[PDB]
PDB file of C-alpha atoms in Angstrom:
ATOM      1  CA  UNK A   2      17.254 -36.125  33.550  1.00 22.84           C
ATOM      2  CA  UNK A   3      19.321 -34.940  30.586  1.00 21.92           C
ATOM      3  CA  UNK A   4      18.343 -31.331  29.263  1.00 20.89           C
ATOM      4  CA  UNK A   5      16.310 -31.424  26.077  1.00 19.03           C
ATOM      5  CA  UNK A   6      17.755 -28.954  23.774  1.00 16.80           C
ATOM      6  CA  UNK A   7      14.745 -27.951  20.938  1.00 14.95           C
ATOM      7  CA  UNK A   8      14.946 -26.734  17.486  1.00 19.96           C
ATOM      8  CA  UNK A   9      12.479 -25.352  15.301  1.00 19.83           C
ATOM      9  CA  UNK A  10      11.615 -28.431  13.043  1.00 21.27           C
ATOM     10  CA  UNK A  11      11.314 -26.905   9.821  1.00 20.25           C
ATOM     11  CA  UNK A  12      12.033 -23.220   8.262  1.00 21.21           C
ATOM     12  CA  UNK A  13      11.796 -22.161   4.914  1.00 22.80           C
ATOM     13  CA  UNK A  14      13.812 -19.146   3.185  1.00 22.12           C
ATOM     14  CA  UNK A  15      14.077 -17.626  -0.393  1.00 21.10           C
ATOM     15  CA  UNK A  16      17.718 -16.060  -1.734  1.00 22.04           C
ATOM     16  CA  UNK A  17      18.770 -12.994  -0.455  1.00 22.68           C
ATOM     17  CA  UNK A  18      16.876 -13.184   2.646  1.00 21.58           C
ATOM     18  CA  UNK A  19      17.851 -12.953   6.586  1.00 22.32           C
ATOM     19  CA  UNK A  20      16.593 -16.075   8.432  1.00 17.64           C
ATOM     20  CA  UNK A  21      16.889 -16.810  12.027  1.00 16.75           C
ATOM     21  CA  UNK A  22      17.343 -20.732  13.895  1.00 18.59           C
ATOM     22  CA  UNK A  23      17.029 -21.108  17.406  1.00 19.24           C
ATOM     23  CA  UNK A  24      18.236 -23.597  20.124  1.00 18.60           C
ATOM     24  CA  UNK A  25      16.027 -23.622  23.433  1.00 17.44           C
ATOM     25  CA  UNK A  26      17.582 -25.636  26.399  1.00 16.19           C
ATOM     26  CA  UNK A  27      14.602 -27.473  28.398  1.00 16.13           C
ATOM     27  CA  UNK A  28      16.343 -26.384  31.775  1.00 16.60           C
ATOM     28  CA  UNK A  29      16.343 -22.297  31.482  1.00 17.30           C
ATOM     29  CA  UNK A  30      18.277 -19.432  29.711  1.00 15.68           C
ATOM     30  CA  UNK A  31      20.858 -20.656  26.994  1.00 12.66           C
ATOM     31  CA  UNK A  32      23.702 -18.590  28.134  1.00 14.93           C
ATOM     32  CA  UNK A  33      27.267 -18.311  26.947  1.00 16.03           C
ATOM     33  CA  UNK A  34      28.105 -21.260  29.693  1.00 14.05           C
ATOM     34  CA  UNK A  35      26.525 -23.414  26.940  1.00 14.28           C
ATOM     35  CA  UNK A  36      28.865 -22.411  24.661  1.00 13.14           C
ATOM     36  CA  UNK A  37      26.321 -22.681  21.708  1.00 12.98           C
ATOM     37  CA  UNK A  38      27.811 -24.376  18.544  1.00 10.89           C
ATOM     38  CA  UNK A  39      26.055 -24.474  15.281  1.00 11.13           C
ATOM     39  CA  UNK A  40      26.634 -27.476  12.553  1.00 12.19           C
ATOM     40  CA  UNK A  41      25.197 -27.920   9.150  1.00  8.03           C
ATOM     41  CA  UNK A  42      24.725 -30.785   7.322  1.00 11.29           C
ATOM     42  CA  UNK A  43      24.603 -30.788   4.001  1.00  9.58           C
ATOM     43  CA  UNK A  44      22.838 -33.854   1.528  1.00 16.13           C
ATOM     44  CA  UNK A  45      25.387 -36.352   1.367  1.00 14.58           C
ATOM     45  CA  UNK A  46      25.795 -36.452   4.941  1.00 11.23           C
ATOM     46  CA  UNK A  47      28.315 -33.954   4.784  1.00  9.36           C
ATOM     47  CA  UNK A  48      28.888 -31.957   8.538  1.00  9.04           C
ATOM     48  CA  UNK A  49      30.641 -28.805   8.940  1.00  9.55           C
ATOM     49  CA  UNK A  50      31.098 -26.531  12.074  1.00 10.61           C
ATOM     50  CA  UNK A  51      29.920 -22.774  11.457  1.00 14.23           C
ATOM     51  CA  UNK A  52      29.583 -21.549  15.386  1.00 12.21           C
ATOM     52  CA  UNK A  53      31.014 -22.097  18.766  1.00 14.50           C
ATOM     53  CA  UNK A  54      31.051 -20.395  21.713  1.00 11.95           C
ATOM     54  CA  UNK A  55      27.998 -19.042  21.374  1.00 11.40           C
ATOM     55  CA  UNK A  56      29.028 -16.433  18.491  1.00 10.60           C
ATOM     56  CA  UNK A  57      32.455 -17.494  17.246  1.00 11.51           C
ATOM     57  CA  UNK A  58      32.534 -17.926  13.365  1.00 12.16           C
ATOM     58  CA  UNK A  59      35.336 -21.124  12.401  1.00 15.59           C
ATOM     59  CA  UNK A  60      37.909 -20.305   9.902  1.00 18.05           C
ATOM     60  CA  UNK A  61      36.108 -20.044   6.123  1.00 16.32           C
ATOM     61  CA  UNK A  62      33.127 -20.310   6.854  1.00 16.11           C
ATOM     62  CA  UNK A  63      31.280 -17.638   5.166  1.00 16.98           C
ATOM     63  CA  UNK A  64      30.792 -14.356   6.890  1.00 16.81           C
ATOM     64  CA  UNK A  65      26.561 -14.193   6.408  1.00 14.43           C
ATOM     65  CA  UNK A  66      26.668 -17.000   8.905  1.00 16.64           C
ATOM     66  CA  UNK A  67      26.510 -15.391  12.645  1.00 13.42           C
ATOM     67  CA  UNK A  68      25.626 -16.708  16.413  1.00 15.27           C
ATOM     68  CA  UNK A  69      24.150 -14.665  18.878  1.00 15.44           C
ATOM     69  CA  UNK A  70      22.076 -15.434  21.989  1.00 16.04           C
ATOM     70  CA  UNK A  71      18.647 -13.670  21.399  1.00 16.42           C
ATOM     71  CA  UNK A  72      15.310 -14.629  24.020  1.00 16.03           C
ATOM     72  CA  UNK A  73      17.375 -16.924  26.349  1.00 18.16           C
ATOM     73  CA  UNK A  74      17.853 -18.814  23.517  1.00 18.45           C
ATOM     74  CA  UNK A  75      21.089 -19.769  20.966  1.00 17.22           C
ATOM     75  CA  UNK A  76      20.293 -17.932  17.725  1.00 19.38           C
ATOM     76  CA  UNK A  77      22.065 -18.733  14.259  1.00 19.50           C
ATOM     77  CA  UNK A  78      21.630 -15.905  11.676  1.00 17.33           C
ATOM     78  CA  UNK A  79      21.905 -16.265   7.864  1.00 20.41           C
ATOM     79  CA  UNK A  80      21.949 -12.947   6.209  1.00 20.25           C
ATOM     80  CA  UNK A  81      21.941 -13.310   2.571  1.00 20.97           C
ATOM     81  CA  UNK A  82      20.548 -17.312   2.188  1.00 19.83           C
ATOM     82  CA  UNK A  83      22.121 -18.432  -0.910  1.00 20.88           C
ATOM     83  CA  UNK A  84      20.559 -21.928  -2.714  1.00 19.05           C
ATOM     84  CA  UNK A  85      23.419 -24.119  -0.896  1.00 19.72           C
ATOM     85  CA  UNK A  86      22.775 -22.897   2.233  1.00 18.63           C
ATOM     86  CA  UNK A  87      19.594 -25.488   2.353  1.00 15.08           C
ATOM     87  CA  UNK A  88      20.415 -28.017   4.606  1.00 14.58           C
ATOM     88  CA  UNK A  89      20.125 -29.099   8.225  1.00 16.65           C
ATOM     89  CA  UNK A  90      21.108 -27.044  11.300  1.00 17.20           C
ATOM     90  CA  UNK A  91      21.877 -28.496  14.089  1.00 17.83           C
ATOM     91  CA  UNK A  92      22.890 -26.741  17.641  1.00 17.43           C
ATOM     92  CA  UNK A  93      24.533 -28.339  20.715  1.00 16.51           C
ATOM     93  CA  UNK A  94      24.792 -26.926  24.361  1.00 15.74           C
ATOM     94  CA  UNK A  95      27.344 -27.623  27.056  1.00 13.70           C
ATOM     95  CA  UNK A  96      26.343 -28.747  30.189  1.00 13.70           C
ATOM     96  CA  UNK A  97      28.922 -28.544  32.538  1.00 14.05           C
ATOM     97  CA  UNK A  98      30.562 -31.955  31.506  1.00 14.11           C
ATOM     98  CA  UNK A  99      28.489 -33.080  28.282  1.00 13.89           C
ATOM     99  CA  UNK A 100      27.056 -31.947  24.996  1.00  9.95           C
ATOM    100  CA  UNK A 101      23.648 -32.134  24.531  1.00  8.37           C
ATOM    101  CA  UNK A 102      22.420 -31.846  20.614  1.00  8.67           C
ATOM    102  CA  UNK A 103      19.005 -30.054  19.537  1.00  9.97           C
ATOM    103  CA  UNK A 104      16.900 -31.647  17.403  1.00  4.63           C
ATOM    104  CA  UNK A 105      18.020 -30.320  14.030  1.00  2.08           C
ATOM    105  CA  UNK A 106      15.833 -27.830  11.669  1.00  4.38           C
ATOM    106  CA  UNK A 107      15.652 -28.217   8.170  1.00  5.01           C
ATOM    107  CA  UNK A 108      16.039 -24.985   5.982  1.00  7.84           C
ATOM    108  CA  UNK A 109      14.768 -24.972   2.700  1.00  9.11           C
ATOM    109  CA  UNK A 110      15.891 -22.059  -0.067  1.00  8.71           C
ATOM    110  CA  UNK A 111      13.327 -21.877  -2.134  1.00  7.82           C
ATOM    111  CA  UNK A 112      14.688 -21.165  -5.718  1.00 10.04           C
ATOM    112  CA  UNK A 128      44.461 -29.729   4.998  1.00  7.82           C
ATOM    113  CA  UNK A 129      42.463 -31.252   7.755  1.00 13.61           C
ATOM    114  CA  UNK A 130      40.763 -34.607   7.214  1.00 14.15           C
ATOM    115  CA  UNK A 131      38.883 -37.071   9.651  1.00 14.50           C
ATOM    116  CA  UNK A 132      39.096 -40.497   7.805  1.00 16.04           C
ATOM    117  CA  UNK A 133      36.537 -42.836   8.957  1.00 12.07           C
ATOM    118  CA  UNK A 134      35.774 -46.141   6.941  1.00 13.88           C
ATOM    119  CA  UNK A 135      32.691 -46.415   5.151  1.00 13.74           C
ATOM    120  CA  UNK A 136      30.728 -48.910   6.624  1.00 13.06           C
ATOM    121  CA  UNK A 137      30.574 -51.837   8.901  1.00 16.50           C
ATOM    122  CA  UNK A 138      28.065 -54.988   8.263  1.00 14.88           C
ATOM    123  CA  UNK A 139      28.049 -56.914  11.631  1.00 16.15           C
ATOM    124  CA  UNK A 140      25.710 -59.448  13.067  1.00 13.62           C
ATOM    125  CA  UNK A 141      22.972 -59.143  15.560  1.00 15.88           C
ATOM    126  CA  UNK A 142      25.150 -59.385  19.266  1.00 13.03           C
ATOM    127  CA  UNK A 143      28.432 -58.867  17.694  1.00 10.86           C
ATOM    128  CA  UNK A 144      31.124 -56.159  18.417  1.00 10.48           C
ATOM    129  CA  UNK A 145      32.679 -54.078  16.613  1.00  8.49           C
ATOM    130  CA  UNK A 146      35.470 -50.965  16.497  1.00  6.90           C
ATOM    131  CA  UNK A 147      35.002 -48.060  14.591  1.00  9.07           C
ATOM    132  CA  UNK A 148      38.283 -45.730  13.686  1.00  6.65           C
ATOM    133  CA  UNK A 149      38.690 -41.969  13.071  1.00  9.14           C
ATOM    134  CA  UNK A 150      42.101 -41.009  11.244  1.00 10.54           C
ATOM    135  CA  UNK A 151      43.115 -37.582  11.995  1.00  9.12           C
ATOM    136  CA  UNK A 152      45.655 -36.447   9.226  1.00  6.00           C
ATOM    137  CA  UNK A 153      46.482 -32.365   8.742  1.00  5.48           C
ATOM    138  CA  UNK A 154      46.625 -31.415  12.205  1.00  5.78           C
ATOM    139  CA  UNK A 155      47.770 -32.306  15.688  1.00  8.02           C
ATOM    140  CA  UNK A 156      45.804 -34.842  17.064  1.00  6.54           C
ATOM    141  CA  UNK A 157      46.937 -34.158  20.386  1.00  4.18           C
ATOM    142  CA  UNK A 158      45.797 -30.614  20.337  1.00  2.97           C
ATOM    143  CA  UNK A 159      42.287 -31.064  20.270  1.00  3.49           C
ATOM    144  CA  UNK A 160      39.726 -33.353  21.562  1.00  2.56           C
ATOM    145  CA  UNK A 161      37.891 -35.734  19.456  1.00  6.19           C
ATOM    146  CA  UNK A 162      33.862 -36.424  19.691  1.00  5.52           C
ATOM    147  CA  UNK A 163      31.865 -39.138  18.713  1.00  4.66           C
ATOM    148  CA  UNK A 164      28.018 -38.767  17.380  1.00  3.43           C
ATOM    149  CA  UNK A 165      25.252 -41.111  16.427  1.00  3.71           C
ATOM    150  CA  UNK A 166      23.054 -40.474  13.923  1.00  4.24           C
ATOM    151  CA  UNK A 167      19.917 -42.780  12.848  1.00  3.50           C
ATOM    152  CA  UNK A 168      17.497 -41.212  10.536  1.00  2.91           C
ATOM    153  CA  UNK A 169      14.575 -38.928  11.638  1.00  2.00           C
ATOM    154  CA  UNK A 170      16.246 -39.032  15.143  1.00  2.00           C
ATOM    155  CA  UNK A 171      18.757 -35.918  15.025  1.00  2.00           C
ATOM    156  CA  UNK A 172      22.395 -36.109  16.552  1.00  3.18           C
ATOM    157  CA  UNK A 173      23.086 -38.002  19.994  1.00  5.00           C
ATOM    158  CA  UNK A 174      25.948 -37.006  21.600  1.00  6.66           C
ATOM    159  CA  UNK A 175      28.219 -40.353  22.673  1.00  6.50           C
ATOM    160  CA  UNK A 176      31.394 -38.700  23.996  1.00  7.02           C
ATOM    161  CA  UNK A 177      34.570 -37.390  23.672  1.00  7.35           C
ATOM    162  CA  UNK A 178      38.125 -38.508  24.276  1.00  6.57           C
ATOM    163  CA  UNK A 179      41.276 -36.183  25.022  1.00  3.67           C
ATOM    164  CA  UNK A 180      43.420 -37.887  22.763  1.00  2.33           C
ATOM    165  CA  UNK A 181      46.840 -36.523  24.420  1.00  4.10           C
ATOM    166  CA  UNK A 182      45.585 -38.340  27.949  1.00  3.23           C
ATOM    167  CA  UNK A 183      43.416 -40.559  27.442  1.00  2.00           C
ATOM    168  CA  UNK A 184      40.352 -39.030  29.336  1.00  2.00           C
ATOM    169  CA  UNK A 185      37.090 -39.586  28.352  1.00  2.00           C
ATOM    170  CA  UNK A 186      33.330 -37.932  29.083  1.00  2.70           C
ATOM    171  CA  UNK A 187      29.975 -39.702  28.137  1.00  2.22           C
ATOM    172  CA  UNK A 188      26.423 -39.285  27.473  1.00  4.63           C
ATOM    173  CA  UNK A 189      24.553 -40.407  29.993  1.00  5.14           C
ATOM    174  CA  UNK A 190      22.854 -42.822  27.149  1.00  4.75           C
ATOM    175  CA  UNK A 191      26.156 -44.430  26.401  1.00  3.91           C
ATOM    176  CA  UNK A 192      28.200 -44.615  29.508  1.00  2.00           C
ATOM    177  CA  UNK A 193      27.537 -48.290  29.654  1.00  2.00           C
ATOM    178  CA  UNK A 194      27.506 -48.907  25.939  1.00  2.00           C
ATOM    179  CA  UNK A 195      30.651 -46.717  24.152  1.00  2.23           C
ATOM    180  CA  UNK A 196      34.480 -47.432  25.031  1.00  4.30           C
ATOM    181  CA  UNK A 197      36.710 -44.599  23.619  1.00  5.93           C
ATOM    182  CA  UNK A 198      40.215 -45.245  23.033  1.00  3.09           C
ATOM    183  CA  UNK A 199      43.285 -43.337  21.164  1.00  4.35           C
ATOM    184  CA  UNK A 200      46.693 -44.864  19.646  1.00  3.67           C
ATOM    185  CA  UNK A 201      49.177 -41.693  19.664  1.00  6.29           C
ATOM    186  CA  UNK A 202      51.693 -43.128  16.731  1.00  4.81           C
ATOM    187  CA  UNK A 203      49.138 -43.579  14.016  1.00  2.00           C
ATOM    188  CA  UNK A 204      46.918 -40.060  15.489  1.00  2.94           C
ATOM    189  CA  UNK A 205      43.732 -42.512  15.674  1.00  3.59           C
ATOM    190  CA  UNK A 206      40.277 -42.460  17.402  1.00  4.39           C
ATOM    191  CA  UNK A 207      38.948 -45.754  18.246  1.00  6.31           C
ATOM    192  CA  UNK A 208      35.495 -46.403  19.540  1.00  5.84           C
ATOM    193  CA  UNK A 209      34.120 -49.985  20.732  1.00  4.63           C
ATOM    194  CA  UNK A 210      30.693 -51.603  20.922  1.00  6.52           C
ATOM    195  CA  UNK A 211      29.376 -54.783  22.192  1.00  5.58           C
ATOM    196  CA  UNK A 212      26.092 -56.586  22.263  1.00  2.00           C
ATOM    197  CA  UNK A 213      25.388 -54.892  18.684  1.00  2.00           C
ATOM    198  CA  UNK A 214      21.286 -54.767  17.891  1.00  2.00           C
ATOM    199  CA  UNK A 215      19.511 -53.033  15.157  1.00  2.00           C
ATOM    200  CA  UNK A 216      18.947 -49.905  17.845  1.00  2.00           C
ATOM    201  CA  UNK A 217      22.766 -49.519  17.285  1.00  2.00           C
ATOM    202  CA  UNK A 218      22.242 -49.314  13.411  1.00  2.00           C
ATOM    203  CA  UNK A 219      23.272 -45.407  12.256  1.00  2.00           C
ATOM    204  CA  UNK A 220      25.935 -43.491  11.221  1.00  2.00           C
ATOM    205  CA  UNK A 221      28.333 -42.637  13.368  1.00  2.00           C
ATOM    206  CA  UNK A 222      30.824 -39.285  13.272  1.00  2.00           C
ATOM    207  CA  UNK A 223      34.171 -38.392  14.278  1.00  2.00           C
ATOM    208  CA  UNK A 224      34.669 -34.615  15.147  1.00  2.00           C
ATOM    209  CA  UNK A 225      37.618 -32.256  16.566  1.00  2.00           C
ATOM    210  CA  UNK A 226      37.286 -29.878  19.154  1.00  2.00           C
ATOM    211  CA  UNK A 227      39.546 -27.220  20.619  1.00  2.00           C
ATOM    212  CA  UNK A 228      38.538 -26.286  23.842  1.00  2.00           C
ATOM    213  CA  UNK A 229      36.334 -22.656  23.427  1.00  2.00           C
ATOM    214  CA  UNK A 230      36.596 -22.787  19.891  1.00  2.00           C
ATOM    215  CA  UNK A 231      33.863 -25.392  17.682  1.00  2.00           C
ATOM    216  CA  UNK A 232      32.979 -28.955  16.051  1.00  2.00           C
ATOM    217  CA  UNK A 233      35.112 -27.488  12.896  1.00  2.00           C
ATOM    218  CA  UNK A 234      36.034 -30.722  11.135  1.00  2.00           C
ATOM    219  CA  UNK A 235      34.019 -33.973  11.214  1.00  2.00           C
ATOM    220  CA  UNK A 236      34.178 -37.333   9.542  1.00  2.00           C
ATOM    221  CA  UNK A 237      32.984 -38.537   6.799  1.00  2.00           C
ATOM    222  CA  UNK A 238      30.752 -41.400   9.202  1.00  2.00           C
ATOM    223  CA  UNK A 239      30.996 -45.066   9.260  1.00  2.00           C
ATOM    224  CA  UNK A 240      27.671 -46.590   8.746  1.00  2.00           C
ATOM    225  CA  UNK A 241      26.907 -49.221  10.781  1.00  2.00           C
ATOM    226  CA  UNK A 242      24.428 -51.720   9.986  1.00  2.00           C
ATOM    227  CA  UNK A 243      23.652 -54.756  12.103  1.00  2.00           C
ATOM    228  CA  UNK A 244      21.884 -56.980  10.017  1.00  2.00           C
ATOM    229  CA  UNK A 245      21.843 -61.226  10.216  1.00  2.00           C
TER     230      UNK A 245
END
C-alpha cells in the first residue's frame, strides 16, 4: 500500500507573477519527515534539483524558487515566473525507507558535476540489459546515487538507490523483484540490471546524486530504453 503522493496536474502563470505547486501525500500531513524535494524538468528531458528538505534551496539555483510546507502539504513557490521557468515540477516524499514521486504539474508562462549515462539501449523482447551512470566532478562515494523511470504521461517512479561507498541498496516496492543495483569504486560507476525485458520496461531511465538531508541536485542525462523485436 505505497502512499500516493498528488500534484496539481496543470497550472498556468504569466511573467512576473508568484505561483504556488503543491505535493499532497495520500497517507496524512506532509511534514518535514518527508523531507520534500522539488525537481524540474525542462523540454529536452533535462532534470534539475531546486528543493530538499522540505525548504532547502541547492547551490545556483535561482533565489525566486522557495519550499515551504503550507496546508499539510509540500509547497514550491516561484516569485517572479520568468518564460524558462515553464516546465514540469515534480515533488518526492520520504517515507521512512523510500521515495515516493508525485505526479508532476506542468507550468505554463504564458508570454563541474556530470552524471554520464549512455543514450539509449535497443534490446529485444525478454532480454537483459545494464544500464551505467558515470559520476565525474565529485566524490562518488560521498553521496548516494538514485535511479528513476520515466515512460511518458506516467510521471517519475522511484526504482532505488544505492550507497555507492557500501554497497547498500533500498527499493521501490514496484521493483524489488525487477532492479539489481550495483557500484564499481575505481571507475566511480552506477550500474543497474534488468531481466525479462518487455515493452512495460520501455522509458527513460535517470541517474541522480543525493547527499543525505540535502536534494536530487544533479541527474543524468537518461538512457532510453526501448525494447522492441
Amino acid at each position: 500500500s505505497q502512499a500516493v503522493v498528488t500534484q496539481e496536474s496543470a497550472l498556468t502563470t504569466s511573467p512576473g507573477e508568484t505561483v504556488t505547486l503543491t505535493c499532497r501525500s495520500s497517507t496524512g500531513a506532509v511534514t518535514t519527515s518527508n523531507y520534500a524535494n522539488w525537481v524540474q524538468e525542462k523540454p529536452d528531458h533535462l532534470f534539475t534539483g531546486l528543493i530538499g528538505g522540505t525548504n532547502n534551496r541547492a547551490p545556483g539555483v535561482p533565489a525566486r524558487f522557495s519550499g515551504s510546507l503550507i496546508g499539510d502539504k509540500a509547497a514550491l513557490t516561484i516569485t517572479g515566473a520568468q518564460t524558462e521557468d515553464e516546465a514540469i515540477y515534480f515533488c518526492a516524499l520520504w517515507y521512512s525507507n523510500h521515495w515516493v514521486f508525485g505526479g508532476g504539474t506542468k507550468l505554463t508562462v504564458l508570454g563541474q558535476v556530470q552524471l554520464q549515462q549512455p543514450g539509449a539501449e535497443l534490446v529485444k523482447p525478454g532480454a537483459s540489459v545494464k544500464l551505467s551512470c558515470k559520476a565525474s566532478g565529485y566524490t562518488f562515494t560521498s553521496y548516494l546515487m538514485h535511479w528513476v523511470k520515466q515512460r511518458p504521461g506516467r510521471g517519475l517512479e522511484w526504482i532505488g538507490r544505492i550507497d555507492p561507498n557500501s554497497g547498500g541498496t533500498k527499493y521501490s516496492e514496484k521493483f524489488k523483484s525487477k532492479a539489481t543495483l550495483t557500484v564499481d569504486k575505481p571507475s566511480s560507476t552506477a550500474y543497474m540490471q534488468f531481466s525479462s525485458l518487455t515493452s512495460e520496461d520501455s522509458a527513460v531511465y535517470y541517474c541522480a546524486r543525493y547527499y543525505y538531508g540535502a536534494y536530487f541536485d544533479y541527474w543524468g542525462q537518461g538512457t532510453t530504453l526501448t525494447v522492441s523485436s
